[PDB]
Amino acid sequence: GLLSRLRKREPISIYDKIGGHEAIEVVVEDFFVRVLADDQLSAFFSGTNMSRLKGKVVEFFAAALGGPEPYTGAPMKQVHQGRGITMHHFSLVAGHLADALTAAGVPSETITEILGVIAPLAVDVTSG
Amino acid sequence: GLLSRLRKREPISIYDKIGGHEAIEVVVEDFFVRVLADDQLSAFFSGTNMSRLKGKVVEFFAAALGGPEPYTGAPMKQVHQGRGITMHHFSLVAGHLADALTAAGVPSETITEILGVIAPLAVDVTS
Numbered sequence: 001g002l003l004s005r006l007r008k009r010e011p012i013s014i015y016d017k018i019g020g021h022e023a024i025e026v027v028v029e030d031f032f033v034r035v036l037a038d039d040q041l042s043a044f045f046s047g048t049n050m051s052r053l054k055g056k057v058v059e060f061f062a063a064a065l066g067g068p069e070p071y072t073g074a075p076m077k078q079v080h081q082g083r084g085i086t087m088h089h090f091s092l093v094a095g096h097l098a099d100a101l102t103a104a105g106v107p108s109e110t111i112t113e114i115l116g117v118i119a120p121l122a123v124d125v126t127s128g
Numbered sequence: 129g130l131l132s133r134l135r136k137r138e139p140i141s142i143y144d145k146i147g148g149h150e151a152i153e154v155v156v157e158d159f160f161v162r163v164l165a166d167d168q169l170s171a172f173f174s175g176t177n178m179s180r181l182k183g184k185v186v187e188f189f190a191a192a193l194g195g196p197e198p199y200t201g202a203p204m205k206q207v208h209q210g211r212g213i214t215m216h217h218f219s220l221v222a223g224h225l226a227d228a229l230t231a232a233g234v235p236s237e238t239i240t241e242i243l244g245v246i247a248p249l250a251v252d253v254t255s
């Protein structure tokens with residue numbers, strides 16, 4: 001936990017400074033409200049079990065940002081390959097994530113930092 | 129509230145000097161009376177859930193004006209996209225918001241300041 005980590009002189013992760021698992025859950029739920037309300041994006045999710053997807057995305061984001069929870073989903077490249085996702089769609093999704101973070105009161109500098117973790121994933125997510 | 133914020137030595141926001149969230153609620157009500165009575169604007173809001181929109185507008189204005197709570201709604205570009213809103217329409221809306229602020233007793237200088245915050249948003253809202 002954050003307390004145990006501080007006793008061990010480990011620096012505070014992005015996961016911990018934004019509020020850990022509960023913060024991420026709330027952000028991911030809001031993120032998908034936004035993504036599914038966006039008609040440039042909704043159709044990508046037409047065949048998707050959304051409770052399941054959100055579960056996996058919480059796990060992925062938590063792990064990417066320094067959380068201790070395992071990611072129990074499939075590899076990014078495999079999942080996204082062939083879905084005709086361009087950098088335009090990736091960027092829109094990134095926008096909605098930034099919006100969800102903003103809505104949750106995450107400081108803008110920390111959102112930028114998170115975007116810097118997430119942006120390089122576009123390589124695995126997009127077709128081009 | 130403003131009291132706790134001053135104790136922290138935060139400078140007084142536009143939000144705080146106009147009376148905070150309660151003042152903005154009152155203005156936004158009157159604002160939309162003006163907008164929906166305007167024949168050049170009202171059809172845009174045909175079938176809109178006004179109650180919901182109003183809460184989001186209050187939230188957006190509060191945040192834009194330096195208020196404590198984040199805006200949690202859709203960004204201005206996305207929400208206004210594909211509506212064909214012109215600078216003419218935006219100007220009318222801004223005019224209606226100015227008149228609502230005036231009617232609420234907000235000093236002219238502060239309405240001018242608020243319009244300075246609002247005016248640059250025309251880039252996202254229009255065309």
Ligand code: HEM
Nearest residue numbers: 044045047048056057060073074079085089090093121125
């Ligand atoms: C921001 C970077 C992104 C991350 C971290 C991410 C993460 C994930 C995760 C964890 C899954 C679940 C994998 C599994 O089921 O094991 C998934 C699936 C999926 N993602 Fe993404 N994703 C990202 C971007 C995108 C974008 C930009 C799109 C399209 C606009 C997209 C569309 C999909 C679709 C359609 C699925 C499949 C759901 C299903 O199985 O039907 N993702 N993604």
Ligand code: HEM
Nearest residue numbers: 169172173176177184185188201202207213217218221253
């Ligand atoms: C003056 C600056 C403006 C601000 C701050 C503003 C703010 C907002 C907000 C907060 C929303 C709701 C977003 C959401 O649902 O998450 C919205 C939606 C909307 N706005 Fe504006 N707006 C502005 C200008 C305009 C103008 C000029 C028009 C048309 C003349 C307009 C017409 C609409 C319409 C039709 C909606 C959608 C309502 C619905 O959901 O049915 N807005 N705006």
Ligand SMILES: [C-]#N
Nearest residue numbers: 035053054057
């Ligand atoms: C991917 N959500």
Ligand SMILES: [C-]#N
Nearest residue numbers: 181182185221
């Ligand atoms: C826009 N109301």
Ligand code: NA
Nearest residue numbers: 078079080081
């Ligand atoms: Na695939």
